[model samples]
Target: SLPREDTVYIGGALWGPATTWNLYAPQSTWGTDQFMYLPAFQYDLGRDAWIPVIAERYEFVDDKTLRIYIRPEARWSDGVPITADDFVYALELTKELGIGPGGGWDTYIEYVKAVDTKVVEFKAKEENLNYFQFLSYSLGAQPMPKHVYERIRAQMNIKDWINDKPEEQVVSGPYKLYYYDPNIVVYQRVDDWWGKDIFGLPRPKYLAHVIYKDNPSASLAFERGDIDWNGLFIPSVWELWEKKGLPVGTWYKKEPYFIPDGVGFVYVNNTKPGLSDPAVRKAIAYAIPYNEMLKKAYFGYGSQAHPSMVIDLFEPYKQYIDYELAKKTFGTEDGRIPFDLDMANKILDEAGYKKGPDGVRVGPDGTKLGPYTISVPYGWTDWMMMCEMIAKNLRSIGIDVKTEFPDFSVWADRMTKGTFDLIISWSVGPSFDHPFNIYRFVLDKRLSKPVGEVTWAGDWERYDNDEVVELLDKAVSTLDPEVRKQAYFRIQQIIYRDMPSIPAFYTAHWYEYSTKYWINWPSEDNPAWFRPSPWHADAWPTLFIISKKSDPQPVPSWLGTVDEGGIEIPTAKIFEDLQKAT
Candidate 1:
């Protein structure tokens, strides 16, 4: 018999992807890969941290290496033993496969290999020690069941994995995928699994993922009690929850968790005309009012940005946040820009562009820089609206702009390839280091090639600025915190002046839970679960410590070891088929 209220339903305005539960792929996010796919770690909803469900403890052997000791009781759901070889095999596959499903892995960690079954080590080339942060990604650090794909080695082809039957596959997690249809994904827990009591929380008995093609349908299903939790989609629905007085959870226990969002910005493609001129780039930036736009578009859900790319929302901007920095910079809105059409025209004039017969700006080379195209994902509810508002405002300033809503696939392709003249995208990180990951796009030149990913690398404003490059290198390579801060401060100052990417807004996140099962879920300040997404191994272990109140059970047999499967998987075929499907 099941407890009547033991289930939880989570909803969201939109879903990005949920292909295979293979956390080893480069494109995985913590929300899907670590949050729901893997079972070796439990979110301590009590402590707001991720603690070890499979590993007992982890130690930093050096600045460049880490050691993990797996929980002796941990095992595959299929009865296979969890071992160091599993971790090693997963790493090998990542380097070999290049994970085409997830786009470019260069933005992720480049190198990882295990030392032993119970121990894993990561070593980076001297200049890329900062790249250590990439290892913290779910895609970069996820473990795999080596026994599941061992037979594929004999075939020497990886794509054969797509058509492989699930019956022959072995999983080490708490649940195994029983069915995956176009609409839903279903998994059943292994009987008597190894991690049953390791985290002092009730192991999930079953995980049923109900997928709908649209947001309205998903929300309706929740209304029908088919789902336990969902991220709010319709703003009007907040009142519905209030009226029903349902099992609602808000920001009840406030934690001083730094509010970071996909700070909106315009990434200027240096290759584009007119924008290639630094002054012209500055003129385009001057046209948008970030603070006013936020108030109008976001309805105060986000904060006004300083129009500088260097200041990450998580860290306080003290060094470069001065009146001088603002005055000298491109869009430093220390209370200056607000419907300033005259000032916008003045900047363009100084940049050697003038009003033509058509009343649009024409450059010295007789080139008309008009109709710049800006793009964002099609389905995001709030952001797309904001983009439309921005486009309207841009037109008012005589900068003809078009707002295009593309599919996620097109968005990813354009962003990495640097195809669009301007782009609107959002990113969420657990800490300042996470946004620093974007430095991979903004800093390195070698990693920015192939006309995609980090298109702004050498051509930031299409203007050469060697000083900015030096500052970025110093920011990442310096071991001293003070040195790093100083480097970052100078970088911020330059960014405010150049405005290569306009800082538009900050990211915000919320969670809603049911009251029927757990009494004290972690609050924002003191998380009751694992550190909310985008964290690394250092903070991940805390997930095990979050307290929970639930029924207990005996450890299952598959939990202690990796269950070697009898089926032969065709790895290359699987990869080929998955490529077509995604």
Candidate 2:
């Protein structure tokens, strides 16, 4: 029986019936989102560094090669040792199945081999000059158990393998799937987990998520103190604090109380006739009432974003932004297109779009500007309101637009199948390589699947420019800051002129917590802890840091550092040395 203090309850939204629990199904949300397994290392967003978890150290042999040394103490829950063979097998299996998130590394990586009992080496091709992502991709490959999968590979179709056997569901992390039904999914901590001796047992033995049908119901559950960790848009959370005296806290006690996680965009389907016009797209960008939408619809949780796709809220990334070029091209410097209806109208009129008797726009070819529908999932009220506001503003400027709230499944189908005209959705967030990650995913058409085929990768806008792609390639091909900066500058200039998509707001990390059951959740007040969001690979180590309010323990000093049983190799120094190797 679980003790009351050892159980933490939270809420979740059901997207649909999840198919495969196979950790590496290309789009499987199971392994990563559920946090049942740990990767080689965890990226601490709060610290902007990598921390070792499963693998102990990574040694750079050369630019195109490296050796990863695994921790001997790490073991699966079933008491079998995790070895270098497991890492090698995981890579081989991903290559064979042609699935898994990191399988694309096959394109750049020459070979992966088990060099020693505890060491794995990755050799890359010379053209694979993405040293940063090369390290990240190598370390980020989640190792699957070779012993279990090797036996199952011949008996079953490896791609469709679903090992639901409870005894066979071995894990190296702190938790295992305990139970699930239509309404909830539960995870229980592994009492005798391999790392428990090094890091103290996680505070909660039981982590339960009650799946709600909609955001309103989830917000109600949060208000009632039934949810310990809250990430949903709790409308007027401060007002709820006033009315219910909710035992909750955020990163800040005031307005814009969120860490800048990523950017959100008003995605225009470039395949659509009028939207394909750069001038029309620019008009749409200018017409979006960014400031008003952030304050009213988003509850001041986000800030207006720049047009270049890099979120400017973080000052370090701001250097790559060409603010002067942006101003000269689009008549705005804050990195955003100017929000002026008059400017939007002038651009549209100058582009030879004529106004009809009804005051609606008609294109050069006499096609109607739109009867376009901007859609968001029905239950996501914040995005819904943003869509509504955008639609209203577009119509006011003589563009025919309307907002549609569809069931999330239908809306998601449209997004993946390239059926949607316009939508408001999140862009990729900050990573070890900021802005480049954004550029590659948001604009690179190479990652796009054929229309009607399902894919989760790039250029959903269907917008492409060969120059932008070349610049992105150059930015990642070298370690020099000036070369990278110049490529980014040209890319930004192209973005303002082309207006591929309009960035609407900075996406919040969606952090919120109750101090009722767990006390030391990562927050601005206690910045040392890992970020509390569970929808990331870092969740396993973050869970390791959390403690019971009643029986709290001191956080380990090595929690966010590479010293937690690992060694750090300076990436640039290693790259420089590799260049001189003769």
Candidate 3:
């Protein structure tokens, strides 16, 4: 039996039974992806910096080329030294399946050549030299065990191959798949992990995520002290500590108690008849009860959002925003479109939309203001409330919008194909790239597809303009901060004016941990990690630093190296069985 003290019980990360161990596969579990694999570097959100993981260091050969040195000490759990070839293989493998490591692999990265045993050169595409994107991707790409994958490719179809055999996984990270069932997935820390001498051993001998069907059930389990660390949404969360007197804590101890991760948007499908008009889009923006959404939908967990795709929550992002222009355009100092029903009506009235006898407005061209459905995934409790509030707010202003809660699959299909009228969506943010990436995500036509066609890229709302495209190109073409800022400033002006997507509110990273079992979790006082998304690889540092309130005494007969049937087998015994089968 597993000792409670030695194991950390995590909640809200996994929602189903543990499945395949392959990252490329759709159903890989938390342990296989989060603990057993690692990226080249870990990005610290608070510090706005990168820490080397698999790499020793890096040198910019030039603006167009980056040379990275592999860590001499880096080795897979199987005892093979990690080299440039591993990085090269993973990059090439991902590209073969038409998936870039991040946004810039196909557009900016030209070649990743392992020039030397320790050193690899990443040359950029000559036409678009996005140094910021390239720099960020140093931490973005993950290197797998090249020897294991190369053999798998030779023998089987790579895409169809789901490496579920835990014993077969050659991981570079400290933990390996130990045992799992439908109830929970457990990861056992390796006894002789190579990183122990370098990064130090993580305190938890085992990390397990108990799969819960929904958020409310998981929240109840967490409240009962069954969960040590969590990332679940809890309404009026202060009651956890102040009312119950538990040791529960978040990033902040006060209101807006969570660090905002990304800004959420109300994506207005530009192909829609009424929404195609900038005036209609701007009117709907004014109609959105942002403050109401913040208080009710988010439970006051985030700051008010702005049309400037740049997040002002952090000082680094604030430096790039044109606050004066924002103030001038929207008449708000902070860029938040206020809850002004009068302003919304006036904008609609002046733009030749007359309120019909039935209270719904009709445009001058005989187009009804709406019958537009604002949709979100069903059971996304908070966002459902947000969409409902938006529907109520817009209806009062004579726009006939309604909320539609569809299954997640249907919602995703409609949004990705630009088939929806309006939707609540998030592209990217709380990233190191500042506004450029977020701007590229929402506005750039290069990433867009025409209405009724499926696109894996951004601009799903399909807002196309030549100037926005040109500005994005200029911003990514060079590394000069001022030039990029100037380009971004212009892009912000266009986004605000175009009103393609209405900015709603900042999205929280959603962290809440119980200190009853573990201590030294990243918090305001600790300053360890600011962005503590449980699924993110950068969060590994905090896991490494945190220790139990008391050290665990060894419990005899601990299990290891489980098979797919959930039978715990010894590591040596499994290898013998595998060799015999071969």
Candidate 4:
């Protein structure tokens, strides 16, 4: 057993039992793709740039070619050197299997070849010269060990490959899987890790994630100081420190406690009869309680969202924003439509939608405003509350909408298949070409399928606009930032005019840390910065940045003094004595 002082307990990353370590499988556990396997480059939020991970550097040779150079020092946990050959093999495997990136990598990339032992070259299709997409893959691709996976592929089918053996889990990171059971997954630091020569050794000797059933249980554990790093939403997080006086902190000390990552949207199915009208959609947008949602649902962790697809958080996306237009039309800088019941009713009234006996509005074309469903996963308490607010707001405006909390599987099925009436969702995370990526995800027709079919990429609501598609193509194909900006600006205008999807708030990267067991956490006061989600691949650097406290702080309730049961915990006796002595 590892000592508590040498370990860091994390929560909210893993929800269920640890299933498999397979990098490509859906059943793969929390740390498999993040801590066990690593990507070529990591996107740094603090610098708004890419940091080389396994690869030393990368370059664009020509319009059709991209080359990446692997670092000579990088090696797998089993002491095997990672080379360009391994990188080429990994991507080729994905392309051949028709999995992994799901046609995105294969759509633009014609072939990937090893130019040399250390250098790999990618050839993009001549017909589709999506430089933006190629760049996206360059930073986000995670290559597997060729020698290990090739044998596994030959022995059994790739789909059935779980990679259960701990010895076979050969990771490139500083820590390797120690032990995993139903309740918790533990990773022990490798003292002789190859990265110790390049990047410093990670401070925590043992990193642990305890699997809780849901967010509420995780929140309770986090407030009790049983978790060091948390990635779940805690309602009104200010009370964790301000009121409780716990040694807890977030990225900010005031309101909007966390940094905004992407846009949270209410996707309206464009196929619905009354919802098909832009007037009805715009009226629904006005009915959203954005400020109330900020205070109640998100607990003031994020600002109001811009009406467009792009997040107005950073300059990369902000440069393309129609600031004056969004402010004038939506009545907010972030493009949030005002929560005015009168305005909502007025829009419907002006559009000739009149109230019936039940107070539900009836469209001029005999379409009822009623019976629309707003849904999200049941256990997502915060989003559930937001949907509740939206439903009540719509109800007041003579729209018969109701909130539905389905299980994750059912909700995801409805969302992807476009069978849902209205659903609250989030956009892609910030990447190299995000505004383009953001616009593509929400607007591009190529990414979606018919109402009943499954759509993998985006356009979940299936708002088909030829103008949006043409502009997105121009945005991705061009090299000039100004040209892309012009295209993105026009796309934003269309999105605001259409209101196919309602932007409620900027999605916050919910990160909370306790200074009790560890310090140097990324906060407004700390210099170290990166994505704070414990599950994110970019958060690997945080382990190296944080320092462990010399002595542990007080937990809300001592396990030793609890009268719940005579539980058998090895550290309860020794750790209790140490805490009493202090």
Candidate 5:
């Protein structure tokens, strides 16, 4: 009556033509996000923890040094042993190319050395001895196959090198690039995967992603059961299951079905004349209709963001809010400067921004605020609406603003070129190095490049504050909680005063799946695995946990989800809880 089978059809998105298959390529595409290239470690967001994958274990020999032990069973798809030399070569290539995750770590690391065939040691600069990011950089950096790259690096540009060979594509992960074209990228499971004995293989025999033109097209395919796993923005997702009854499910069974992936912000170009003034920026922040925008445009998918750039709704992140400091800085009860048009007008008037004859605000330097555009990628209806809401509110406050929906490539080009007045984009997610990671991405000016140069991982707005720079630098390179707290509090103060970017709302990862073909997928009720976000490698394990609809078994509840009913537990306690329960 039932045929045992293994194949998961995934519906995916592609911003444009992929630049390279190289995970270390400076400009990352969906190719890097696929997790086909395994890293030494992957972070489990549900548990708020990191789990070793390729590396067996790691230990810090001293404050400035770290040693990693590679798993003996690990090997490249080519049957080559994944050794310390491969890791070292990968690090070396990162430094040579001036790209990849190592770029951030390379800023402070003195040198990375291969101690033996299976061991690698990282030595940090004295100043970076206690850097909080040291652990993340040392253990989590994705490794490239040295054996393959070494042969190609000399003859070709490492950054532009493409590995499209089907017969001899060397990889360490369970999936290989099976085929690709303009419309799709297909990945076939490795039959003799090296880690099969240890990590086990993914349930699907073939994992294929059919690329659609847009979200609507993808949704249509989903309803047809052509897509098993989906990564698309579904407006009013509840209606699909409640009214339509299409048998789709997410992490939650009720409202706010999706969890916060990170914060989205209205990024203002600080270099612009009127916006350069801190008072003007602060006024703009106060004028934003946060509640209305989140409700109408985002469909209540996420909540308003905390001023600290940390979503206080998350339990573990709440501790880092510095509520008292925010209250003192903003003179508000909850430390938030709520939307107030009157207050915005009053502040702009007092700051020498006079209303012209047309009633449009003019800057102290005689610069007009008219004709500035707030842009989002075209076809992203939600973000486009949010931008329209922002523009309308700003216009109501006598600051002339317009909304533009451009093709993603056009908008991204403007973002990197430092030309757009305002745009909405993701900042950063909570990680092992969290608030610091948040601050570093949004406020750190060191990663920024000069105008007309493309630097994807940088402060594109060019918002520079000496105190912010100094504090952030100190914040990352220190282990003392008190030291980090001091730096963070001061940084928050500056953020309130200058308003580099307005944290609009917590953004969702757009994870939703159909159970028509597969069952026991992760959900609030059955937290067998975390949401399988294609962008994150950690969630790749979920591919193995899913079972075919024809031959299903009782999927046990995840031990990590047992405590507090699927809420995030502190990282240190996740393993402890598992050990005690066992």
Candidate 6:
């Protein structure tokens, strides 16, 4: 039996309607509108390994074929044995039929066959084990209960799944939708969930999700104890936390946080007039003091990336570098990016760029190239400021500089259009083969489109490096790790030496939590206690170390309270007030 007090209330930024409670459909990642869900496989960050929650274990019999053994103990909450047919049904329904509410990456799975009641065999069209990507998208091939899907199989296409809120969709997770309003979703725990024993899941008594329209409302709920933890705090929240004497404590988690880069260098857009020249690109890279700007402006959050494009965290690619050889090639300079106007000018002179009357660098074609602008997304205000600071510093080298801040949606458009001369965009990867994950952004003719009629994979710099592209193709197409490492190293070397992307300081992800909920809940290391339970938030745990001494006090649960300060006379009146304030 689960503890009666073992309940959790979550408050965070919410999007549009997720009416379906199904988590099994291939395209179900975004339905925050859904009542409850869970991942089939968990990436244990602590062990740097993968663990099974639904499927028993993966068997790679060959490079192209694999078997996923289902745990005998596993069953749906409604009491059906978690069969291989369910898994088989889910994948076939997705790409071929469009089984869930969203469209999943169906192209990856060439075919899936059911060997028996307990085994599902997946045959890859290619020889590749994209472990991280598989973990992330495993549920895309979610094992749907055969009975529930049979009725709606015809309606499972992408257009219908997204358009209708069908009630027949069933899931294997721990919670059931009981009551839902526009502002909140309450999930009553399944009394006899089959996953309770196989996985260390505590049947949640209640799972309440209070939805706020925006971030301010979410913050208010946290401060008043209506909600447990805040989503994430930006720099603007520091002053508020200071004023309230820090109502929340700290923790670090791997989110889409800015992590340190092992290899970082400036990427000169070859299409740009002056940047096309290798000499000018190298000279400009030498002029920018990456170390100085990183330490002074970023508060030392990042390190100066070497000329190699590989990050030190990934071990295999380290062999690609010969440090002594590189230092000899590019002047030693303590391996630090120092500001050197003399060297910048000297390199420019050798490259044939002469200073005009206005003191701005001019190319051979007499093009002024006066003011170069570095653009970053508006969401990362910190990075935008750093770019500004860097641009300001570069004035010492006769290069006029400016910074552009575009709204979130338009920034990438600006990038693909090559509208900006320079960019400080953030790139991230959660998986090993992240070297190649692209959204519809890849669909454009100008950028790298992996799958298309023309399939212009290297359209983005209009870069035509046959060697690097070949390596990338082999890295994904083969099962050999040694070959993968060499390919990535060469790719890194090209980008690093060419200086396509300048290394900015990698950022750390920080969070604040109130100690009043639960004591010593867990540290950042193994912070989350994963379970296939509703209240058991896998993305972020909701249960906390509740104070034993202080009695349960009634307070308004308002997300806006974090932004507005804590609640006073905490009552239903406060709750209503909080909701409105949100």
Question: What do the candidate models score in CA lDDT, each in turn?
Answer: 0.50, 0.73, 0.75, 0.75, 0.74, 0.48
Ranking 1 against 4 by TM-score, winner: 4
Across residues 154-203, which tens digit of lDDT does each residue of candidate 2 receive? 79766667655556678877777776666666678888988776666777
Whole-model lDDT, model 2: 0.73
Off by over 4 Å in 6: 1-40, 70-119, 124-197, 200-247, 252-289, 313-322, 329-379, 394-401, 407-423, 429-447, 450-464, 474-485, 518-521, 524-582
Give a tens-digit lDDT track for model 5, residues 114-176.
898888887766663436556666767666788898788788877677776667788888887
> Which stretch of 10 consecutive residues in model 6 shows the poorest summed lDDT?
449-458
TM-score-best of 4 and 6 = 4
Better of 2 and 3 by TM-score: 2
Count of backbone clashes, every candidate in sequence:
62, 0, 0, 0, 0, 31
Q: Lowest lDDT 10-mer window, candidate 2?
A: 565-574
Backbone clashes, candidate 4: 0
Candidate 4 stretches with Cα past 4 Å from truth are 16-20, 78-80, 93-98, 124-128, 147-157, 176-182, 190-192, 270-280, 315-317, 327-335, 342-372, 397-400, 406-419, 429-432, 448-457, 551-582
Query: Once model 6 is optimally superposed onto the true structure by TM-score, how far is the C-alpha of residue 45 displaced, in angstroms?
Result: 2.6
Cα error, candidate 2, residue 388 (Å) = 0.7
Could you estimate the TM-score for every candidate?
Answer: 0.72, 0.89, 0.84, 0.83, 0.89, 0.61
Question: Candidate 3: where are CA atoms >4 Å away?
Answer: 15-33, 146-161, 176-184, 271-277, 346-373, 377-379, 398-401, 404-421, 445-457, 476-479, 552-582
lDDT of 3 by residue, 1-582 (tens): 678888888876665556567765423566665678777766555654555667756666665677788888888988898888888888777666543234335556788888998777787677666756666555456787889987887998665566766687689888888777778778888878877766778888888888776667888998999888887778889999999998889989998788877878999999989999999999988888888787888898886787887888777788788888888877886766777889889999999999899899999999998788999876567888889998998999888889998765577779978999989977777765778878878887766767765455588889989898777667867556788889988888887778989877788878888888788787888765676667554566657767788753221111111342221333234223323432
How much is 254 displaced in model 1, in angstroms? Answer: 10
Q: Candidate 3: lDDT over CA atoms?
A: 0.75
How much lDDT does candidate 1 score?
Answer: 0.50
Clashing pairs in 2: none
Off by over 4 Å in 2: 1-3, 12-20, 23-34, 78-99, 146-165, 240-243, 355-360, 562-582
